[PDB]
């Protein structure tokens, strides 16, 4: 019987984390947490959650799984099931070194041959965002995700609508339909602002508008989608299928996107995924973290019938040894080679990083601004 | 034990009564009912209420709140709500004087440090309008709300919308988007003109649009938004919880106006403010009135995260001692400072002007016009 | 083209006001608003209501409904319906007068012949109501109103909710099914009990239920009608047809009571009636109040097809102000239409003055020292 | 200007964790997370929270509040929210201080002069509960909360069914309606069983059954409700007013139930409560905790017109940590105000500091080894 014998976290100097799970038999599990912003604390569940790992069967990933969620406390949101997502990946990590074959493997195998990407583009003028693309394009690219605000703040006003749908404009005049792009508001649009917003960016045909308001109530999506063509994405700020089954239920967003590193894993995404995909809904996994969580995505994207784009942020190849196993062309995506995974961890690299380890935004009139 | 001792009310030369509470330890608290257009039914209500409170501790608000509310009678609606509004921000200011701090500092503090303001601008041409927001607008404002209506009765006729239209269209060209209005109807818009005025004010892009069509349905709202981009403004004419509960639950309000001179008071309109945000429905309180009104409104807009825009109709300076407290800076407005509400009254003044105290619209075919 | 000249308020000793409308032609209208409790406040709003009258045709009752209703101010509510409920009896009486009929006349004539009363019955312990009822059933009347519980105290808890059924038990024993009970427990009932006390009470088979709790939602009384097939009656805490669509649309009452001096008068109560016939909920119009109320309650009752009991305070003192008390006496708890002209009462006016001028004039608290809903 | 200086958690024996806040001025707050289960993921989000507070004025609670709750990561959840809620105390307990007065007298002041309290009552067999009960009866109580089942083991047979509601016809058999129990499942029912153990204990008439099963859906407990008269108790599972008006809307719970030390302190709790009493929801605040979390509960408790019963531990070691021991005593089960400044509890700081120091710190299967759903 093969036992766990040891969960070890490492912080990394940009904001990522890996956790490692080491077993008696020497096959070494990578995970990924979300930290952003409460590193400590989500550490600090990773080694609580430990307690139901060290010297237990990590085949049994069921098992841990449901065991962590449900069997010593509540229900986890935003900090357990980061936690419990990192640790998923590294036990489908160890279990597909253990049997030699990637993890999508073990999910039923292939149901695609390469899987289509889309790159964040950043650049503080239109021309720095276009000069971007452009660049990428060179790079066979012609799906983007751009943030859809350009000043620092909420959009408030007719005035600050205009200059974010003329930012647009002006990225979509240097292309014409020859590029898509989606569009990311990261909440930072007011309620009464969102519904003129999405109709002035209507001419510009974004491929989704993503998390234009944040979602107090599950009908919110539903009505947003009643009033325009575009498409809507959501599901970064979503933990379970038991939060996903509300936004579904309703109906009005068109494209889901859970985070690998935040819903609970592999376990739990594949099970997001299957459901999204009785309610004809498109699968693209928010991805902006390291190699370990695009791994973790992947695997999820080369299963599920309904994937249909894959974020990456491609840095994270840094600490990857097979760096050509994520090589691009023509925006696609391979299935990744290796067992487990796919990714050969640089681990005295990691180590290293990690021994040198060390905001709020507020309104005009003093008020706390919400995460962006 | 600080004992209640009297009540007096006094009428006041625009159509504004205040209230006085006194204790037998001679701290004095002010309120402002609602009276425009039934005062002796309203100042007659102050006085039956004033049975609960003679003889009674002030620092008991809830207690107090709950026995005028339910206690001796069916619950009220408005002219019972006015008069409980009265009396409790009077308690409240009580408080605040007892305990030495602002009402604010009582409950549980600043989310904020100013308070985005906007101010009605009347006129009887368009010209008229423009050259009264210019001259605001080098006050620093550049939020306002106009009167929607033009012509004297209702908007019934598609020549009487494209007159409201036109108007609206010559402001907007005066400024394009550097400034923001917010368009009031009185209701004086017949039901089925409301949907082409809505949209025929679209590429105007007002704020908002208060007050439509008179709800006689909680559907009617939702049914308006589904069709327009326009936030809709609501809430003048509701008085407690239950009324706004109704309206929040269907939706299509974006912006809630509850009146504190109204709606049972700070007491009721703290908890009225809380359930909106829960809705993701602003707050932007309705005060078209004076001074201890409008310190009220301020200290419901500093503790509630979810409050956007005060109304102020800067007269109802003239009562009040400490001026400069309420001076405005670029349409922001500062926390009260003073204890109790913050407002000095000048009693002197205010028994004078109360000593000399002293109409139905119809539509053309001699019907009666419901109240503006 | 006659005119309002004069309206002229008058305290009365069973907590009850009388108005008094006047014309130039010396045509006398009277109206009866409720006050229970806020009489200071109703009747400040009867006399700021006046300056929409005072030299008005009152023949144009609409046009004075309407713009009382809703011209110099935001609508409707527990004060202002019930000053417009009073001065829109007042109005009808004068119309009737005028044209020399009885209102029912006016509102196109009999839809019944008499019209089935009964009456609250009161008493501390089971046996006096018991025989409070079978003094009643003597004259004729098999149907009463009774209390649903002793007396102050909320049900909330299950010792309560038995002692409750226990009283029922008893008075239902002294009858079988000989005799129609209605229970009112005036929202006196916490909402964690209402169902168990519903349930507990079936067996004994009351005519109806009356409001158990306080409607706080729209959804309230439906989700209770669910798990009963006792009727639930409702609609004396509601002021317009505004807020009766809102109840019948979500279903659960079955039995409407609006009250003639609080709902708007004559002109909206025909109007609620016609509104809850299209529903099929029958119509029992709330009536503890004086002759006038009455008398208004009963025209509505003999032009409204749904119309199914009236209460009424009989059971002497209702009596007194009127002198024409023949034209109200029960047999076999039936009551005939109203034979004199307008609301079909001769109010002993010099009466009312007189004891007008000798009129004088509460809060509960749970044991915690906070607040009871108000209960009467 | 005054400035927050520290904040310092101390863990203790009944597994509580306290917390410490202290200014610049010399006024110190405590508060109290709920640890149960994840005390050092807890004790780290305090800390990391404690980034937003080191050298802010504790005076602008709402700011911090709103802060910690929205500014630097995802909203809410089981472990922020507790820590948010044991923050929330702190700065209420200074403000309180700095004015001189009890918190429920910054919140409006009192609506009632006394709180209904119960204790929860355990015992291995029928018998042992009902002694408990009876010792604590002799002491003026008439409510209490007992476990619905008799210990671990999720009830998803007849048998199961069988058992629990045998015992519970016993404790009833020795009271009658003389007592009221709420009875605890702790969601230890299987869904298919809910429906039948609740039919089978409505002869028993316990005031409520509190979380029958764990709510996957909105519906769930609207679908129970509507088969019951018993009404059904709510709430320790959900950590925002977010939460709670997803189960307001679709109704089925009678009695909202939030822990103070869990739903984001005071300053959520009062919002909660306002929510609830517009859906006619009573409010039983969940307090199976140390005396910081108690009077915490007190000031909403008194403050809230729907409060109708508090929960407390103390049926002598919540007491150990106080000084102040008399503020907390009980006459006929009803506790009185706070009576000092702030939360009002006089904390023996240097018991703390030395209960803290010795502080050292499972897994339910079913037979099958599928691991079972986490109860306490
Ligand atoms: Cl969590
Ligand atoms: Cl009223
Ligand atoms: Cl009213
Ligand atoms: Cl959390």
């Not at 009005?252 to 004809?280: F, N, R």
């Not at 990456?312 to 696609?332: P, T, W």
Request: hydrophobic share 45%; aromatic share 8%.
């Amino acid at each position: 019987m093969v036992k766990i014998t040891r969960l070890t976290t490492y912080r990394l100097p940009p904001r990522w984390m890996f956790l490692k799970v080491e077993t008696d038999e020497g096959v070494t599990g990578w995970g990924e947490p979300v930290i952003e912003g409460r590193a400590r604390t989500v550490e600090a569940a990773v080694h609580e959650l430990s307690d139901y790992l060290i010297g237990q069967d990590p085949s049994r990933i069921n098992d841990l799984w449901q065991t962590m969620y449900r069997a010593g406390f509540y229900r986890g949101g935003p900090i357990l099931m980061s936690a419990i997502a990192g640790i998923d990946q590294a036990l489908w990590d160890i279990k597909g070194k253990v049997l030699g074959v990637p993890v999508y493997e073990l999910l039923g195998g292939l149901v695609r041959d390469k899987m289509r990407t889309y790159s964040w583009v950043g650049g503080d003028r239109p021309a720095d965002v276009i000069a971007g693309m452009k660049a990428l394009q060179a790079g066979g690219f012609d799906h983007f995700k751009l943030n859809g605000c350009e000043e620092m703040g909420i959009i408030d006003t007719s005035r600050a609508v205009d200059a974010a749908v003329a930012r647009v404009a002006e990225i979509r005049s240097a292309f014409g339909n020859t590029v898509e792009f989606g569009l990311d508001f990261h909440g930072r649009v007011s309620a009464p602002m969102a519904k003129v917003l999405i109709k002035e960016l209507e001419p510009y045909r974004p491929l989704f508008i993503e998390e234009p308001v944040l979602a107090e109530q599950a009908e919110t999506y539903a009505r947003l989608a009643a009033h325009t063509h575009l498409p809507i994405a959501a599901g970064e700020r979503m933990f379970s299928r038991f939060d996903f089954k509300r936004v579904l239920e309703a109906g009005g967003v068109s494209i889901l996107q859970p985070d690998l590193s935040h819903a609970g894993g592999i376990t739990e995404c594949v099970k997001i995924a299957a459901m999204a995909e009785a309610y004809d809904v498109a699968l693209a996994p928010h991805c902006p973290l390291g190699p370990i969580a695009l791994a973790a995505c992947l695997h999820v994207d080369f299963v599920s019938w309904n994937a249909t784009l894959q974020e990456q942020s491609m840095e994270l190849l840094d600490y990857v040894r097979n760096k050509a196993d994520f090589a691009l062309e023509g925006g696609y995506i391979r299935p990744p080679r290796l067992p487990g995974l796919g990714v050969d961890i640089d681990e005295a690299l990691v180590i290293e990083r990690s021994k040198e380890a060390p905001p709020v935004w507020r309104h005009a009139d003093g008020s706390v601004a919400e995460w962006a």
